[PDB]
């Protein structure tokens, strides 16, 4: 009765969504046909015959990555009106995905979203899976969050961004894109979750002992986080937390709405033995400066608000045991104007492991969503990568030639300059 | 007879940070002043974690005097203003990471905070 | 389906392309007839980027072959993979350019250009969504420099929103093959810095040493040099028509690689390059393929990358591998060579990984350079242009064909304007 | 409830620990796999599925001897996170185990120790096994005992040194490594036990009639000492001594904390017959100058505080018998200011023989630990093996070239000549 | 995994190494192809100390072979165990050193040193953690004394904290093979005592007698002398690549051995050395293997150990044995020979025990001497330098290559500085 739909912009969103929708079809027994041998009406609008089809829109400008889905294992599952393609990709260009190419098929997207809200009596929220690097994921998304805020306004709009790494970069104009796509999503989103690649490569090597992972084996980890925020809308928990509740407990100022996810336990199949994994143990796995999936140091900044999302056979006395030890510790510094810094969620489901996978089978798990000050250092980086390229006017002429002002960048950096000063505004402690 | 790192720093500037023939006039601007200081230990100040050379120091153990010889930057740094510790692998000819944080004779290069450049 | 149109101008371009379509057709299972004989359907999901389907299951190359003497056309038509072309495409005059620029761009070029463009106009109408035009010509001959850049200036009037990547062949420093190739190359850079988005510069001097040392060959025929260039030529579009983890087309390789609209002369590179017997003494790993690439002894442009500095770098890998290794090795060869890369473009290594190797290997790297290392390539030609201009030898073969003396002063001032801008960003640093 | 962990620095500690952790698994019935077909919680933290794992940290600097354990019989038992290696060993060089190599991975050790104290509510003490010879055993231990006394301070710390023999030597700079490591460990260790190699060859040849033993057969004897010092934690007896009770009953002054060990009975299988092995007999087996495990003459010095640790089937009336006869005897001279020189534990467990062993099966045993003045000659020996190899400045340039003062050696011996005089200071008897 | 690079030079070093890689390949079960065919995994747990894995299961030796005439390199390439190498390693000139120190260090060495180090740099990149460099050369030849000492001075500028052990072959007292080899030995000791951590010293005069007396052979070919030398060369690093009770490496045998940074010239020794039929008359025990070692009739350096005294002694044993005997026998041959060991180093016998015998034996001992007994070996050559310099014969073949007359006055003053220190510690006593 509370339904939530999911959009997939760009190459990054579709390949994440392949790992997502494969995982839900294992939690519920759903075949690739949509058959099954019922609280899952939140994602699966059924048919008069036995078939469940997802509430997903796979939008892209190049038809390349979509043809895997139209020919792969989950061809039969999706609805062939959803899979909107185009002709030319935005091609690492914000000014093509927002002014030129994305303007063409923005109407076919919003018409298809219109036909998915009408099957929903109690429409809950939006999920956008998009990167910051490429042109489609950062330029077509910034158009799309603009349109749904005018169309709806009241509904909760969650993103799951892919934050560009401080050390690994697979693009050259990538700091031009992330400044422009933050100017737009700042006022028309609700809670953008930050995920980095470089921090997952550390987690895939140290905690998992896999030397050679793939985008496949990274996307199995981002699927588990997405399947942990929305596992409270899909099962019968002792303490359920809604997507309308994450917007309140984590956003103290309308500018600052950038948490960073963390999952635990992340262990191999052979190290699944040799340790006991109680909730007094797996809680301390989360607050490490080495298990966060964003390359930042949480000992530099301060946690404004945590949000622990337990699941499995977890008992809420031991949660009180686990949490009370934490804010007695010295290195973890909660913010002084905020005496309460948690939000607990217990669900009655163990995490389900995909066959041919890498994560071990555990009976209890935790996602951790937390809004720390420490991402201000990660925003200090993209202003320094911006000013080393704009001062020499590098790569400007590919953006001017698709409808852009040459002074629009310096206006958009001034947004990021105000956003940089807001974290330091909060991280101080006004006494008396 | 004591321990030094002057043949390592001379090896490191000439092969990893200023190796190309573009920086060959700039390499001679710094290398000729290194032969005159009587410091046993030296250490290299980069800018980012991408290890681009911008400054060179000299280090005095038991006093932690980190006076500046060449480059651009502060005259003296402390243990408060440090981020990472590098070591010049003569094997690989690549600066690796030391997971420790104590500035000793095995440490060959470091990075400072972003606050000291704004 | 993002269709590409392949023009072949000059003698050299007709001989690279006669091997290039032999190179492509083994990636799709195509006989000399034109019919399909491959195995996997992934050959045929994007077969329509280069081919038009004919009746009965055949396919013809979307290829246009331009010459002035009819000698090389018969060699293509008599040889294998010659009947696969369309007999309507073989446009040629009856005079021959005579190794002359003013004859092939002004005198004889202005009489066969309309018969070319009407087929170029025809081949664009069969396409769904036109991606862009690739051209294959010299910079030293009369045809490929005179008839070639005539076709660029007409097309960029006709198709302004289309990428245009000429895969030029640059003259060599020590050995030459034309007395007046400094004259025929300074007149063509005037057209190529203003009308083509990117231009992959390739030498012959550095291309023999790759055949001599790395391949370990004794007698390298042009059918073994162009055999090597055509590997790079498919590897640029190897992810425009095959699935991958991370993708690249002809447009992503134009935005990330071109920092300024004039500085767009690139330089290739390829790996692995074994021997006949020394293939079994090296490991076939992604860190091994990377260190072969960044040598100065593998760049097909005859200039040292250690002279000058890099501005941007592409690396279009193929085959199946792991994305962690690539993202670490591209980090690895940036830290130890941070003097070679420029500072005001941070993390400047564009990366692209296909899922399909070349037919027979396991993995391979195509490499694109963009450097200030070609500042002496133009400085060398602009000196041989200048010393042969003071005595003004060999001029009456140009002036008598309808050219004024001021045009030589214009293009020389154009090229010293280009060398001055490579020198500008090589020394400009931020604070 | 009284948990005790064990670090094994160096090559000497690991192969002793191979003899040790083989022995505890034979006592408690623990398989090599970790299964078993309730008081043993001190060394074996269990798991939800029953598979007990030891509390061990096997730190080394070369990966050589560690890989034997990772491929041996006890591969499945240990936790594979624990086994910490390096690349280049210190290689008989104190200046490489404390300033160059062991500094690089000292954080990997302490962080894994940090993840072992947190499972322990009743943390009892430490068991650092090392030698004095090599650079890893003497330079990394001198680093590690520095860090744990800063970290913990209050906890009890026990060493099991392999003291360098007076006449057998398998190294060249072996008196350099001890004087550097004793200067460091003197103010951080708390009760270090001395075991020689040479005096065990005397026992293995004479009392056991094995002419050709091995380090294997020299480490089965040191396994029996360590099993019997901690035989009162793991079991239930008539009189149980604790690890905190040793550091009170054996340490008369904060400098003098070097007790040597002695086990009895040590007889073969053929001589297991032909005699009776009473408690009135095995006590007299300990106080012989020929049954010690340190090559010193105990009749040349005075016992300051003995400590007998009986076990098996011992009746405490006979302990009143066997002790009261001894300090009436003439040659065994105690110290005149100490009228009371014993501390007795009686346990209800016989010593267990390892299959494929050399010792006999006995029904009673004793691990005497004795603090005496007679080790002052063993410290007067290395100072004579120091000044000869320092007057010529021999082997100095391998130490100076790794961050060392060349004037530090004159200071380190100066903090040995004071310890040389303290045993002579205590050994005299102030009248009136 | 502590990898070791095996550089070779000269005619002597190649023929030693061509038997040495025959020697190692039996301890790891490597065929002439390069594919594994052994029995136990202990051959493959530390196979990477001397090898790089190739594609398909093959292995290649980490070996770099340097010459100046191509005669010996063709000889190794034609024989068996010659195709296993990397063909990119065989660096050779075209001139030949001409049995000349100046021509192999100034004239021809300075033109072909760059093609060596660029492959030395490549083999260092394949290593995870580089242990050090072992080099095999002469001290009397032209190449191995001039080109060998160039690859040490160029490497110690590059890898200053790595162990550099040469296994030189010292000229013999009575028999010779070169008229000017007293001039070549004085020019290398200037280069070896400042840049190599240790140097094993081998004569041929001491090496024929062991083939005659102890082995009981009548026709010792070099393939039976180098067969004996390569048992020692494998015996030092066999504790670095096999499990043991008490372990040693290339570093523990450098701190326990060299008391002063100049005095690092070692004299090896091996046992057992049976005959063909006299193997069944001696007992194969640890007390028997020791008394064969400490004779003067088994030392491979032609000098009397009984003249002068030992400073340090390493005894790297092999095979399975009992640790009581070894700790007693080394005590036994220190007390009865207490006038042969020095006083101010007490208990100076470094023990090392491996767990693996040589393939076919039961136990074996590799001995590493360090003595004042090699003070007359330098006193002999400095006397053969002195007579030939007073007449200054054979000088114009060196002066004509850019060498000054002062340079011979330097090294002979340097070698008398070496002799003066061995005499300084032979009589230095403590009180
Ligand atoms: C049994 C087997 O596996 O044989 C291989 C082979 O032995 C090796 C040695 C090949 C071989 O290449 C050459 O010897 C060579 C000759 C002249 C110039 C350049 C190369 C091969 O001839 C070449 C050939 O390449 C292809 O099939 C690719 O698809 C390649 N095709 C052509 O170049 C081509 C040749 C003739 C006719 C038509 C096309 C290609 C590469 C990039 C882009 C498109 C196509 C391969 C794998 C082999 C042989 C047959 C021996 C190597 O080359 C290539 C380009 O793959 C040389 O080093 C590689 C490693 C290969 O393993
Ligand atoms: N985690 C993850 N990141 C991915 C994946 N695919 C791409 N990315 C990241 O996405 C960024 C590149 O953006 P893309 O999505 O490929 O580009 P695009 O949205 O298609 O835009 P254009 O191609 O320019 O039109 C880089 O940071 C990639 O690392 C994936 O499967 N998983
Ligand atoms: N009792 C006993 N002593 C041993 C054993 N192994 C080594 N030793 C002794 O330990 C001393 C040598 O120290 P090692 O532990 O091997 O050296 P290390 O700690 O590894 O240090 P480095 O190798 O220098 O880095 C000598 O006195 C050996 O007799 C063993 O199994 N049992
Ligand atoms: N790589 C390559 N270069 C060629 C080939 N044929 C000719 N060239 C080069 O092309 C130049 C001569 O130009 P050419 O194309 O024949 O003259 P045109 O016909 O008037 O354009 C010289 O530099 C030749 O080396 C070929 O097959 N391959
Ligand atoms: N042990 C040994 N010595 C050799 C061998 N070949 C040459 N020598 C010695 O090497 C010396 C000659 O030097 P050589 O290496 O041939 O000259 P180079 O090639 O100029 O370095 C003489 O003392 C020879 O006895 C060999 O195979 N084994
Ligand atoms: Mg895209
Ligand atoms: Mg060791």
Numbering used by the authors:
A (entry chain X), D (entry chain O): 1 to 37, 47 to 441
B (entry chain I): 1482 to 1599
C (entry chain U), E (entry chain S): 1 to 44, 47 to 360, 369 to 441
Paper text:
At the molecular level, CAMSAPs/Patronins stabilise uncapped MT minus ends and support MT minus-end growth. Previously, we showed that CAMSAP/Patronin CKK domains preferentially bind to a zone behind the extreme MT minus end, which corresponds to a region where the lattice undergoes a transition to gently curved tubulin sheets. Using this, we determined reconstructions of MT-bound CKK domains on both 13- and 14-protofilament pseudo-helical MTs, allowing visualisation of a wider repertoire of tubulin conformations. The reconstructions show that both NgCKK and HsCKK form an intradimer interprotofilament wedge, contacting both α- and β-tubulin subunits in a tubulin dimer pair (with constituent monomers numbered α1, β1, α2 and β2).
Conversely, the HsCKK N-terminus closest to the CKK core forms a distinct interaction with β2-tubulin that was built into the atomic model, whereas density corresponding to its most N-terminal part was hardly visible on the surface of β2-tubulin. Furthermore, there is no clear contact between NgCKK and the β1-tubulin CTT. This is in contrast to HsCKK, where density corresponding to an additional ~5 residues of β-tubulin’s CTT were visualised in our structures (purple) contacting both the CKK core and its C-terminus. For example, HsCKK loop3 residues R1535 and R1528 contribute significantly to MT affinity. With the improved resolution of our current reconstructions, R1528 is observed extending close to α1-tubulin’s residues H393 on H11, whilst R1535 reaches to contact the β1-tubulin CTT (top). Intriguingly, however, the differences between HsCKK and NgCKK contacts are most striking on α-tubulin, with the HsCKK C-terminus/loop3 and loop8/N-terminus forming closer contacts with α1- and α2-tubulin, respectively, compared to NgCKK. 13-protofilament MTs usually have unskewed protofilaments, running straight along the MT wall, whereas HsCKK binding causes right-handed protofilament skew. However, when the models of individual protofilament from NgCKK and HsCKK structures are directly aligned, this produces only a small RMSD (<1 Å) along the whole protofilament, i.e. the structures of protofilaments from each reconstruction are essentially the same. This comparison shows that, rather than rearrangements within protofilaments, protofilament skew in HsCKK-bound MTs results from a tilt of whole protofilaments relative to the pseudo-helical axis. However, protofilaments in HsCKK-MTs are closer together, giving these MTs a ~4 Å smaller diameter than NgCKK MTs with the same protofilament number. In summary, relative to NgCKK, HsCKK induces small conformational changes in tubulin at its binding site which, in the context of whole MTs, induces protofilament tilt, shear, lateral compression and a reduction in MT diameter.
